Design a protein around this ligand. Structure first.
Ligand SMILES: [Mg+2]
Lengths: 304, 144, 372, 42
DNA sequence: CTAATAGATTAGAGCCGTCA
RNA sequence: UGACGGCUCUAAUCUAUUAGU
């Protein structure tokens, strides 16, 4: 259950990359039918297996497969997701900063922030006012040191709406008059819809606006280049709600759509949710395996 | 009447200042941005794991074909796409435990079994990294 | 034109079945003749790819020539081909990958991308069209005992601080206890439904949110009440009851050229649904579809995991057209009227819900005739 | 301070602290892969 | 100062398959 | 733990009312 989590968590203190490969992937020949039903199969998909592995290993070597270049310079980005540890007093307090994008003249930064700040409450999530100030200040000095100047515009993602006091505290730690906005992104909300004619689902990239604040987006259709569906059955969309701030809907929607292909762990053409939420989700269980670590690194090579 | 607004796909950057939508064909055409060419690796496991890893490593040099071309772009070869060397003749292997004193007689408190497994693997890796001379880059772990 | 007037080299490819092709042999003979014409440097440079093609069993006319190998790795073959080419003093040209990108996108652009044609889509929701203008609350602090709960009652009635939230008349409870009419209705309370749906109503004891909660609870229980007498029964679920119908109960298991109860792994499967009301964008009804199994229609598998495997096996080969058509057919069968569905929420009051789903029109599409 | 007036040992410790902290931050923060380091001294 | 109802809003944690 | 999606089962807490301080 926690084999990989524990192994990577305890090896994290020595700064060594690693890669775990099950033998069944390598030995998919001899694990054939026990009594007439084959256990296992990659014939139809065999070539793609190589595409799944090589580039990943390349990233662990120190190579950059592909970078995105559709970002306005002099902007921010950040994400967040919580986690349940339920160690002793069933605490709900595990917040893992996801990432941040920066333009240091010519390059792109993908290191993110870390530090599992705690919270006495066990079921209400949110965040106490003290932790949030340091949480945003951290990204602030990171931007200062990687920009040799001050940041201009800031964006924030989330998973759940939040109360007034902590956003007010976030506005309190705002330097000068920079604009801050946070966007809540759910995962599943039922808006099942069909195609009137034919035998194919909706075509990927559609939208359905219900108000100047809320919005919707579809991600599992079928790209004409791929000509085949990304999901076996009819898809399920993502519901978008803007919580606070003055943010135009179309630009933020296209921005969050543009950040669903940076899945370095694989090479599938399209992915459902943006990289940020799942990326913080998959770093959280690494640090929740064992909590004796102090100041873990901020490079995602070792985590992934 | 309520209508659906459509959003087009963005574009990603590649080598030589080129652009495309899919990344696979771009890599097959232009390659990565930064050039690093050392994959001196490491591995732990049993000897059958050694031979199977060697066979799979030197197998990937030849192209391998999908069942359906139109949905999966072709894979010509690691050196064909990346311009980086990775062969099955420069591995520095460290031997694994073979007795595996843990058997069906010992199944209560599997947490302890997991602890013993991870302690053994981690100490072996750490000792190999700390004491030996050769410069290793990645560590592959295989186990049934 | 090109072979004679405007060609410098040649790149014959020795595949496994390259000898069979008559056209390649014809152009090969043409190349041999033009070489016999020129006699300057060399023209022909063979290539080999396959492992099955042994080095001796190669095409008979070309045995005299050697070949750069590609059987091991394509990179070294490309490398030695290119440096042999540049050693042969072939005229050069500065590289430009943009032309390669343009050619790649142009040669592979058709039967893909998007088309400006308009199309239509169907939704999953049904909007309400009828509702009584006002609802009524009336509590005497003595009308009912304060211990039993409201799940016992089968008609709209839920407790409250002081305003008993009922839909029908408060004197419609004679069926098991008398003296209902003895409770005078002059001291009753009324709240306009149209205004609270508009949301303009607001008081110190009733806000918009909890009264909206009240009305959605009433419409949900009314939907259950109108469903229960449809003669389609229910199976226990983690969520509300899953409603479905049996083979043979409809005429010969068929209803308008669609089949809903079938056989898979010697088990009989049916097509059920579930529903619940939502209101914020518009008063509409969520409906979702599920597939149910059974041995003979009297009992069902107990294990959820093998049920999961069976439902995946059954649903692997069902797609958008079948999904949409079956949902429309089932909802039309559910329609108790030729135009809508009535909800006899009150003693005589009812709410009408459209049996025709919503619509959508989109201005963008793809190359539809993809066949596969 | 330029002159070794306050404490030469303190100045050496400060310089080594600065170099060590910079190197450690580089190792734990960046993304590239490096093997050696050629430190110049003024 | 504890407990039954009830919606709306959240997270783990397994099983099947991978294009008819 | 080669990765992705689709389902199913389980958990809390917040927000009215109510009975025992
Ligand atoms: Mg990995």
């Amino acid at each position: 259950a926690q084999f990989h989590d524990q192994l990577k968590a305890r090896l994290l203190e020595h700064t060594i990359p690693t890669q775990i490969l099950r033998e069944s992937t390598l030995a998919w020949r001899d694990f054939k039918n026990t009594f007439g039903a084959p256990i296992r199969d990659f014939s139809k998909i065999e070539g793609h297996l190589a595409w799944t592995i090589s580039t990943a290993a390349y990233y662990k070597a120190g190579g950059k497969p592909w970078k995105l270049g559709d970002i306005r310079p002099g902007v921010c980005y950040l994400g967040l997701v919580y986690k349940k540890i339920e160690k002793s007093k069933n605490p709900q307090n595990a917040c893992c900063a996801a990432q941040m994008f920066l333009d240091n003249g010519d390059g792109t930064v993908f290191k993110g922030e870390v530090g599992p700040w705690y919270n006495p409450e066990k079921g209400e999530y949110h965040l106490k006012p003290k932790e949030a100030k340091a949480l945003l200040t951290q990204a602030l000095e990171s931007y200062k040191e990687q920009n040799k100047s001050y940041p201009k515009e800031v964006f924030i993602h989330a998973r759940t709406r939040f109360n007034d006091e902590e956003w007010n505290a976030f506005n309190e730690v705002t330097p000068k008059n920079t604009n801050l906005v946070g966007v809540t992104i759910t995962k599943s909300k039922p808006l099942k819809l069909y195609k009137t004619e034919g035998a194919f689902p909706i075509m990927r990239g559609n939208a359905y606006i219900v108000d100047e604040k809320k919005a919707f987006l579809w991600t599992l259709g079928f790209v004409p280049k791929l000509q085949s569906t990304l999901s076996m059955e009819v898809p399920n969309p993502i519901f978008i709600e803007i919580n606070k701030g003055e943010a135009e809907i179309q630009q933020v929607l296209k921005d969050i759509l543009a950040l669903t292909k940076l899945n370095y762990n694989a090479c599938i053409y399209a992915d459902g949710e943006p990289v940020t939420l799942r990326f913080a989700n998959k770093i959280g269980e690494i640090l929740t395996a064992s909590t004796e670590i102090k100041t873990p690194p901020l490079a995602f090579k070792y985590y992934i | 009447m309520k209508e659906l607004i459509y959003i087009e796909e963005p574009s990603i950057l590649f080598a030589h200042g080129q652009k495309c939508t899919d990344p696979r064909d771009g890599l097959a055409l232009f390659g990565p941005l930064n050039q690093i060419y050392g994959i001196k690796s490491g591995v732990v496991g049993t000897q059958k794991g050694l031979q199977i890893f060697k066979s799979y490593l030197d197998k990937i040099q030849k192209p391998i074909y999908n069942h359906n071309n139109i949905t999966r772009p072709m894979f010509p070869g690691f050196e064909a796409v990346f311009g980086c060397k990775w062969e099955s003749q420069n591995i520095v292997f460290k031997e694994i435990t073979d007795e595996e004193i843990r058997r069906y007689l010992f199944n209560a408190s599997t947490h302890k079994r997991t602890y013993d497994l991870v302690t053994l693997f981690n100490d072996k890796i750490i000792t190999a990294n700390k004491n030996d001379e050769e410069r290793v880059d990645v560590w592959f772990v295989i186990v049934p | 034109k090109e072979i004679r007037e405007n060609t410098c080299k040649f790149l014959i490819v020795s595949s496994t079945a390259g000898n069979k092709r008559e056209g390649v042999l014809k152009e090969l003979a043409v190349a041999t003749k033009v070489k016999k014409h020129l006699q300057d440097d060399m023209f022909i440079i063979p290539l080999a790819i396959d492992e099955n093609l042994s080095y001796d069993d190669i095409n008979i006319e070309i045995v005299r020539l050697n070949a750069i190998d590609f059987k091991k790795s394509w990179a070294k073959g490309l490398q030695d081909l290119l440096d042999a080419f540049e050693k042969q003093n072939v005229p050069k040209k500065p590289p430009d990958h943009s032309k390669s990108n343009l050619l790649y996108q142009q040669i592979f652009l058709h039967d893909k991308q998007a088309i400006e044609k308009e199309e239509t889509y169907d939704s999953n929701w049904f909007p309400i069209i009828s509702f009584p203008n006002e609802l009524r609350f009336h509590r005497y602090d003595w009308r009912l005992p304060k211990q039993f709960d409201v799940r016992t009652l089968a008609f709209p009635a839920i407790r409250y601080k002081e305003y008993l939230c009922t839909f029908a008349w408060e004197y419609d409870f004679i069926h098991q206890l008398p003296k209902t009419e003895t409770y005078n209705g002059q001291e009753s309370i009324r709240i306009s439904t149209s205004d609270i749906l508009s949301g303009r109503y607001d008081t110190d004891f009733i806000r918009n949110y909890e009264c909206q909660r009240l009305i959605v609870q009433l419409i949900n229980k009314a939907f259950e009440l109108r469903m229960k007498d449809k003669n389609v029964r229910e199976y226990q679920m983690s969520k509300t009851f899953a409603y479905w119908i049996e083979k043979g109960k409809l005429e010969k298991d068929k209803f308008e050229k669609i089949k809903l109860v079938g056989k898979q792994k010697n088990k009989y499967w049916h097509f059920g649904i579930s529903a619940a009301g939502k209101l914020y964008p518009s008063p509409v009804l969520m409906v979702s579809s599920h597939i149910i199994f059974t041995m003979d229609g009297i009992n069902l598998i107990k294990s959820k995991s093998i049920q999961h495997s069976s439902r995946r096996k059954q649903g692997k080969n069902w797609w958008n057209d079948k999904w949409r058509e079956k949902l429309l057919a089932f909802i039309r069968f559910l329609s108790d009227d030729q135009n809508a569905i009535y909800l006899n929420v009150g003693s005589e009051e009812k709410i009408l819900i459209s049996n025709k789903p919503l619509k959508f029109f989109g201005k963008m599409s793809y190359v539809t005739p993809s066949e596969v």
